[PDB]
Design a protein around this nucleic acid. Structure first.
Ligand SMILES: C[C@@H]1CCO[C@H]2Cn3cc(C(=O)NCc4ccc(F)cc4F)c(=O)c(O)c3C(=O)N12
Ligand SMILES: C[C@@H]1CCO[C@H]2Cn3cc(C(=O)NCc4ccc(F)cc4F)c(=O)c(O)c3C(=O)N12
Ligand SMILES: [Mg+2]
Ligand SMILES: [Mg+2]
Ligand SMILES: [Mg+2]
Ligand SMILES: [Mg+2]
Lengths: 49, 270, 56, 262, 270, 264, 56, 47
DNA sequence: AGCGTGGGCGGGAAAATCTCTAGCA
DNA sequence: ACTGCTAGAGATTTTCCCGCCCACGCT
DNA sequence: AGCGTGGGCGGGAAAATCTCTAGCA
DNA sequence: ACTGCTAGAGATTTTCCCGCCCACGCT
């Protein structure tokens, strides 16, 4: 039960937060409001809470 | 909470302060400073510092279209070895790429493809062809050229070699064939000094010669292991022994590829 | 039963080995460097038999 | 490592070659190749070379299909060619040389295969070429019947594709895999990699022994300083090197041995 | 010359093989393999892998124009501290850069400038102004943004902070001034937890303390070292003693900063 | 070292030198020097209301062109700015400039039309600046501000032939007053004294910053030849084997095993 | 006249220290990390005093 | 006396050989034939 | 045999450093 | 004659502390 | 006191790894 | 559900060799 924020692809601005659905070792799938998206760990960051 | 904590709240409101600045100026423990940096959603950092892992199983095969001299070049690479083929395409359309993949599967034990989301690799024709050949189609993270980085580095390499040997032949596909031959046989080094031709021979030959060997072994060998693990006195089992150790054996109980010491295990003949 | 496996671990940019294989299925391969039981998944495996074994 | 003397009686009585005595007595391969070299009766000629490839032509539906055969494994492929000229064959033969190590090309002397373009590409490659001569005349009918079987596969799978060359690729895939049998019910790949890997093994042991035959061993025996030699080194061991002076297989301690550098 | 060596020469002529290729296929020592890699002048490689050193002396100051939202922003940074000053320029013209530089020199002890070869930093007005203020000019490698990259990293930091505080102020340069203020005072950390404003105080204060202490201590202290070097019994001197060691003093005889042992030295009172 | 305490105490009794002199001379920790300068009777001066951010502000309209001149009065540093139009936004911009480069704590100005707009109020609220209007912190340097402005006008009278444009000559002139007007007790140009005062301000405020967390803390202590846990004393300097504390009024050293540190 | 010098060496972008200063000129600086007597060019030097020196 | 080859920057090809004139630890000045150019050590190579 | 104290131990917080990366047009 | 560098995120190592409890001193 | 070997050492070649970087648009 | 990576250049360590010479073993 953590928030996540992310750097969108080919962009410098960041968005979020989103809810985790399935964490992976390189990339995570998440739901922002209706956006089931996968995003690499180097292009995003989870909140510890 | 302290009045300095609320002043740090105002300071992060006005200036987006560092955690170390608030921990200095108000004598704060670092955890509340980390929370206040985490508080304002405009204070969002730059992500993590660790690269992912490109899967290295012999049944996978990477492809990519690249561009040079206004022409589209289809390159394919075995991920486990770097055996490379490359060719000119007439036009960047999915049917010709499906013909390319059928040549690939007809010449090589290909199970899984792993490309980007380009226009040529998203037709219905490649879907029909990979269903015809029984290929595991898989695509990457939609705008990350890192998961394709092996074949992108090999796109760099063959174009560097084309820069050496474009002069010997007239047209593009001639020097392309010369270059892909030079890299697949003459370029030596890397894992065991070999070129990738000997390396992919090693990979698939040891794959077959090991999997038929263990397939012949496991129909002969069958031993069932009870075990009493640590922190408990129950003798759990039976389990399938993968290999007998010297002080600790390796088994699988129901799903877990686990290690139990021989004093904590018990191997039954059947 | 006498082969050699090159491999790597997660979050590391270098390949390692050669370990000896101990058991193989398809999904998970167990290998042994000096005394370890490395339960390496197939996506990180590198299973060969180098032809410089003629001295070994 | 005490199999060195009982390999000799095996190649004396039954004359099994170096692979059998190498794998059975668990030896280094060089001592097996030198014991089968000591066979005064049994010997094998080279050009054997398992890079044998046959070329053949057909013009099906007014479209040229050029068929290559790995003769050592019975592997066959073929490609669709738009116009009958030497540049197409140069492109195709450079394709075969790029994927597989071709060294032996058997063909005819037809007009469609005798331009100077393929001669220039072959000089760029360095391939021994054959023109009408079978290396051995057994598989000459096997190639013909295999091309007829591939035409039967085309007759199967022309309803599996719309275009010619698409069905051609489907058919050569099918003959690469779906036609099985033999001693293991194998695919064509499962035999062609066993064909090509032992070639790499034999040439790697050949190039391994190319450097050692320049080198000499001056050694003395135990309980004496009699510096004999120069023996031939076969297996440089960890504590006991393996040599032979005239005909005796010798495991000698490294302190008792001495190596000439060139 | 072995026959395979000239055959390796023709092999590299046809294929440009690896050194390890000719070492394996012809049993060659690696020296002639590296020679034949060095033979073909079309076989020329990717070069050397080590990063150069950007100077760290307190008198130097990086400057560059950058571009954001169609506007040109002139940024200058002190190298040893990371103290930053930046402004919106009217137009990219060297007279306005000279005005910015004269503000910089009038507010800070600036000895040497260090920019790229941009158009604004090449006008004769800048050279007249820096000769007026007595500034040493210096420009970098004509297409290398690396030696001038410590400032570009700060440009990245600056535009990142502009992204944080562009919503607070209405006008652009107002938020820019707020941003450069936030970076110069609020952002703490780095070397010893400091923001750059106290670091540029620290550097210049130690500079205008230490060399004056050194100047007032060298007029008093004056000792002359006649020293016998190693592999030499002759007592060479005199040398200016920099500092007395415990087992090895440091001296300068003619131009050489030597750590000579005290038994090998001889410190005359005058 | 630990016996230099009383011979610093007699120095602050007879001569009443402040904590910097007894700190640097006796090679002491600074906190015992601050406690000795605090423990004096008549050595307790006034508070802050010292300030290094003593900034006088004065507008002038030379050649019908606006020059705003600010002075770091605490060590005599001056700078200025050429301003196109008389409005509050220009003053807010320049005051944010001064606050961005230097830690502007205090500004002394008048209540004129140019310096009294609400954008200036929003700017100094965003920076957190104490602001004065016509009041000198001390009325000594009030004439020095005027004579310094006239001295800068004399410098302009020199170097208007050193430049073509107004503000170019202005920048040349403020450079010249930043360096080419020597003097004082050690021939310093102009900025060496101001970086001295800023460095000393940073050092004393970071020492205040160091001690403001220690005053929460307590140390229950016993001694050698005594397991009794007296206190809770006040910690001066956390030591390696001997710790400096004060129980009631005596500056003592105590073995570290005889200590017990309340962390709040 | 003990001081704090942060510095780095060639081919390494990691700064090290803090060494004590032993001698300074204009181009060459003599410093001391623990027992080495290092001679560092002026364009590699960092010469400071901590305000947290007041504990040491 | 050492041959030098170099990649001119903002370019992917390589040039050379040429003569060193004065070596520096990050960049070296070079005469090609009459071209006195200094070049980084990450875009060249000395034999 | 109760009673009163000390010493390392582990659990844990937390603090310093190391490693590694986006990104600057 | 010139020259990549710098702020942040875990990751890992190191180190006080504490409480405590088991080991050891007092009536 | 001649004569006849031995052992490590250093000088050097060379061989394995570290590491590090351009570059893939 | 996904994932940076790979060939080349000094640089550094390490490891045989050789010769040799100084240290010892025999007439
Ligand atoms: C018109 C002048 C004339 C000379 O050439 C151009 C081109 N240029 C290019 C970059 C650039 O690519 N920055 C990103 C970057 C990438 C890698 C790295 F190591 C360092 C880096 F800063 C600049 O920053 C820049 O200022 C210029 C410039 O000013 N000019
Ligand atoms: C039209 C499809 C649709 C999807 O997005 C584009 C854009 N794209 C960009 C690169 C690229 O940036 N290569 C240089 C590179 C840089 C960094 C790194 F780690 C790896 C690298 F290869 C490609 O190679 C590539 O194939 C594509 C592509 O195909 N497409
Ligand atoms: Mg792509
Ligand atoms: Mg691509
Ligand atoms: Mg620029
Ligand atoms: Mg730039």
């Amino acid at each position: 039960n953590f928030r996540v924020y992310y750097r969108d692809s080919r962009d410098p601005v960041w968005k979020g937060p989103a809810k985790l659905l399935w964490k992976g070792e390189g990339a995570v799938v998440i739901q922002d409001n209706s956006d089931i998206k996968v995003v690499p760990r180097r292009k995003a960051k989870i909140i510890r809470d | 909470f302290l009045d300095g904590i609320d002043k740090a709240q105002e300071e992060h409101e006005k200036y987006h302060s560092n955690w170390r600045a608030m921990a200095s100026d108000f004598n704060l423990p670092p955890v509340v400073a980390k929370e206040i940096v985490a508080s304002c959603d405009k204070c969002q950092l730059k992500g993590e510092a660790m690269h992912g892992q490109v899967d290295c199983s012999p049944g996978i095969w990477q492809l990519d279209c690249t561009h040079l001299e206004g022409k589209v070049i289809l390159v394919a690479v075995h991920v486990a070895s770097g055996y490379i083929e490359a060719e000119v395409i007439p036009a960047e359309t999915g049917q010709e790429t499906a013909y390319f993949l059928l040549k690939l599967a007809g010449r090589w034990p290909v199970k899984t493809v792993h490309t980007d989301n380009g226009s040529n690799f998203t037709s219905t024709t490649v879907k029909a062809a990979c269903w015809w050949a029984g290929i595991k189609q898989e695509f990457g993270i939609p705008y990350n050229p890192q998961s394709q980085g092996v074949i992108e580095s090999m796109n760099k390499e063959l174009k560097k070699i084309i820069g050496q040997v474009r002069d010997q032949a007239e047209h593009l596909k001639t020097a392309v064939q010369m270059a892909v031959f030079i890299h697949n046989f003459k370029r030596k080094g890397g894992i065991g000094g070999y070129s990738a031709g000997e390396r992919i021979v090693d990979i698939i030959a040891t794959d077959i010669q090991t999997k038929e060997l263990q397939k012949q072994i496991t129909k002969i060998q069958n031993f069932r292991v009870y075990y009493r693990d640590s922190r408990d006195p129950v003798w759990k089992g039976p389990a399938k022994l993968l290999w007998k150790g010297e002080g600790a054996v390796v088994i699988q109980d129901n799903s877990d590829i686990k290690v139990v010491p021989r004093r904590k295990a018990k191997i039954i003949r059947d």
